[PDB]
Design a protein around this ligand. Structure first.
Ligand SMILES: *[C@@H]1O[C@H](CO[C@H]2O[C@@H](C)[C@@H](O)[C@@H](O)[C@@H]2O)[C@@H](O[C@@H]2O[C@H](CO)[C@@H](O[C@@H]3O[C@H](CO[C@H]4O[C@H](CO)[C@@H](O)[C@H](O)[C@@H]4O[C@@H]4O[C@H](CO)[C@@H](O[C@@H]5O[C@H](CO)[C@H](O)[C@H](O)[C@H]5O)[C@H](O)[C@H]4NC(C)=O)[C@@H](O)[C@H](O[C@H]4O[C@H](CO)[C@@H](O)[C@H](O)[C@@H]4O[C@@H]4O[C@H](CO)[C@@H](O[C@@H]5O[C@H](CO)[C@H](O)[C@H](O)[C@H]5O)[C@H](O)[C@H]4NC(C)=O)[C@@H]3O)[C@H](O)[C@H]2NC(C)=O)[C@H](O)[C@H]1NC(C)=O
Ligand SMILES: *[C@@H]1O[C@H](CO)[C@@H](O[C@@H]2O[C@H](CO)[C@@H](O[C@@H]3O[C@H](CO[C@H]4O[C@H](CO)[C@@H](O)[C@H](O)[C@@H]4O[C@@H]4O[C@H](CO)[C@@H](O[C@@H]5O[C@H](CO)[C@H](O)[C@H](O)[C@H]5O)[C@H](O)[C@H]4NC(C)=O)[C@@H](O)[C@H](O[C@H]4O[C@H](CO)[C@@H](O)[C@H](O)[C@@H]4O[C@@H]4O[C@H](CO)[C@@H](O)[C@H](O)[C@H]4NC(C)=O)[C@@H]3O)[C@H](O)[C@H]2NC(C)=O)[C@H](O)[C@H]1NC(C)=O
Lengths: 206, 208
């Protein structure tokens, strides 16, 4: 029996609208000892409002059981630690896992917008670049828009650890060269805890 | 039941420069204090091959000692896709654990290299970001470097490759230079090394 503990998604902790959760998943649970005991703690004080799902049988004849603790937004951003303790009778002792926001002082991302190389204009598609740098921690959401509407043809790199201990990434939006030269305003949205209202945008045109 | 293999490929740059030495490596971990002995056989497209060297034992903190074997490989062998087979043989092991590895399969494709200067908005900073976009390349093994007046720049960080919707890959490299260095108008270049380039190498320069 092994335990995996998963944090909330970056966006869910940054908007009060949404519901951030920590997810504790136990896999390889026996038929012969199928009962699973979860305890949850916050900064080590036990907490009692987690909602655990009925054990679900897998095709390799093991159970998987999931317990979900709803996390208040400001506890997570205030750095609190979430411990899932898993008990089952096949185990020498309870397994414990702990997750929290990465420790360190938050740092505000700089968002900078970057049109295609001159040399790229010969192509039928063009690459709109959004650099986001100098952020901490690395939890961040990045989206592209034009005229209030999502652009869906973009890819974003993972966060990369910079030499100052902060993080950067690039997001690349690919558009038709027509749309670019029409034209035309493109918007890179960025949400992060160290930004006011946890949101900024930066737009891009010819 | 006891220990386990991990089996890593050559560095991309070593496969593409005929003067570097590309190596296939095999880190064993969690090794025996009972029947501690280890062996290795190594196959290249079925055919066993003896020109490989086992690095003597390394130590460890938490017990159990590593046992690597590092086989050198032909440039051309690797780039043609031959398989590299790390056949282990530990006694306290129900059977001889195996791992195999080769370059990713598929038509190589040439990277397109673009160079993007700092945003206006960053120009009010004591540091500035020179951006090298590399896109459209396949396989994802690639080396990216930066230089000025034929000297290497240290202060860059490069993104891992990301799968694009093409089924090709892209990455960005960020070079950080003092704003004075960019305003006086020096020349900086992003070097890119990849299979599908001519001579395995192109450069793209960036200035104002
Ligand atoms: C039997 O069966 C079962 C199953 O089955 C299945 O499948 C297949 C196989 C078939 O069978 C079918 O039929 C079915 O389906 C099994 O089970 C299994 O197990 C395993 C083990 O073996 C596991 O694995 C794991 O995984 C993970 C991940 O996971 C995830 O993903 C995946 C893949 O992709 C998926 O699938 C899953 O599901 C998951 O998912 C997730 O989930 C969650 C929950 O839900 C989510 O979240 C959530 O969400 C929601 C919404 O929706 C919301 O949002 C909330 O809020 C949240 O919370 C998410 O999202 C998801 N995702 C997705 C979908 O995508 C991984 O991770 C792991 O890994 C790890 O570990 C390992 C060991 O094992 C190692 O080696 C590796 O390496 C890793 O490591 C790591 O690394 C990292 C990086 O960095 C790190 O990080 C870290 O963190 C920490 C904290 O703690 C620290 O601090 C540091 O610093 C940092 O950095 C980490 O940590 C490390 N380490 C560790 C230890 O962790 C693993 O792999 C799986 O998963 C399972 N599955 C399932 C399904 O569950 C069994 O196995 C069988 N049997 C036998 C006999 O075996
Ligand atoms: C007691 O002591 C130890 C404490 O540290 C500890 O020993 C550890 O064992 C762990 C296994 O439980 C092991 O974890 C693995 O990590 C693998 C990554 O390996 C690199 O990264 C580490 C740092 O991140 C390094 O420490 C490793 O040494 C290794 O670094 C690479 O090493 C080679 C050396 O040859 C090097 O290549 C060569 O370099 C030279 C010159 O330097 C030349 O370039 C040569 O030409 C070149 O060949 C690399 O450059 C170097 N990289 C560096 C430094 O960054 C990782 O492979 C494992 O992950 C896979 O398996 C796990 C489960 O086993 C999967 O869950 C996981 O997703 C990965 O597997 C995926 O799926 C398939 C297999 O499952 C497979 O098909 C895929 O490959 C893969 N697919 C994916 C990911 O999509 C694993 O995490 C840990 O590193 C060990 N530590 C050390 C120091 O070796 C021990 O655990 C302790 N005892 C305990 C806990 O009881």
């Amino acid at each position: 029996p092994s335990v995996f503990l998963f944090p909330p998604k970056p966006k869910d902790t940054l908007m009060i609208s949404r519901t951030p959760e920590v997810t504790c998943v136990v896999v390889d649970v026996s038929h012969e000892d199928p009962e699973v005991k979860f305890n949850w703690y916050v900064d080590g004080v036990e907490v009692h409002n987690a909602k655990t799902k009925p054990r679900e049988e897998q095709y390799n004849s093991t159970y998987r059981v999931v317990s979900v603790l709803t996390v208040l937004h400001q506890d997570w951003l205030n750095g609190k630690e979430y411990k899932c303790k898993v008990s089952n009778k096949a185990l020498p002792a309870p397994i414990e896992k702990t997750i929290s926001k990465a420790k360190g002082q938050p740092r505000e991302p700089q968002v900078y917008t970057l049109p295609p190389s001159r040399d790229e204009l010969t192509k039928n598609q063009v690459s709109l670049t959004c650099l986001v740098k100098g952020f901490y921690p690395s939890d961040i959401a990045v989206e592209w828009e034009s005229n209030g509407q999502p652009e869906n043809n973009y890819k974003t790199t993972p966060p990369v650890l910079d030499s100052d201990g902060s993080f950067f990434l690039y997001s690349k939006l690919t558009v038709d060269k027509s749309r670019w030269q029409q034209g035309n305003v493109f918007s890179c949205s960025v949400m992060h805890e160290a930004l006011h209202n946890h949101y900024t945008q930066k737009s891009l045109s010819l």
